[PDB]
DNA sequence: TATTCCCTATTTTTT
């Protein structure tokens, strides 16, 4: 008769040897000639044992496909600004900030610093855009401050 | 110094 070998697979994988629509099984039994026939979880362990069948050489050889299948399943920154400067930052009607964030295409709206804990020496403003577009707002902000 | 615009992995078969 055939040689008859089992195969531990947990639950979880027991679908890649099945396969969907038996996609895996058919083209492995076609390809192998093997008949897989899965039992119970045999050991009280999560798993499903599976039953192979095949020539005593296919039944070697199909159970290392399984085997080898199976084990195949086995930026934002925020920039300081002094209330000396916030008028030359903004410019008149902010051509300024526009011109930064629509060239550096990044997002910039300015933060309130709490005044009663906050330092009202000093403002809070906001910068976030791509790490590549956050960067290019800090390099004109520079050169302006 | 006062005012702006943008974005908001599962699955199949026969006995």
Same mark, same amino acid.
């Given at each position: 008769g055939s040689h008859m070998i089992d195969v531990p697979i947990p639950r979880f994988a027991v679908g890649i040897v099945? =396969?969907?629509?038996?996609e895996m099984i058919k083209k492995i039994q076609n390809d192998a000639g093997v008949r897989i026939q899965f039992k119970p979880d045999? =050991?009280?362990?999560?798993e499903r044992i599976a039953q192979i069948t095949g020539p005593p050489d296919r039944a070697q050889h199909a159970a290392e496909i399984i085997t080898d299948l199976l084990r195949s399943v086995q930026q934002e920154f925020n920039f300081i600004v002094p209330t000396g400067k916030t008028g030359l930052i903004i410019g008149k009607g902010g051509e300024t900030i526009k011109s930064i964030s629509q060239q550096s295409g990044a997002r910039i709206e300015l933060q309130r610093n709490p005044p009663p804990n906050a330092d009202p020496n000093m403002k809070l403003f906001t910068i976030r855009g791509t790490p590549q577009q956050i960067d290019y707002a800090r390099q004109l902000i520079e050169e302006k401050i």
């Open positions: 099945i =396969g969907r629509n038996g045999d =050991g009280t362990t999560p």
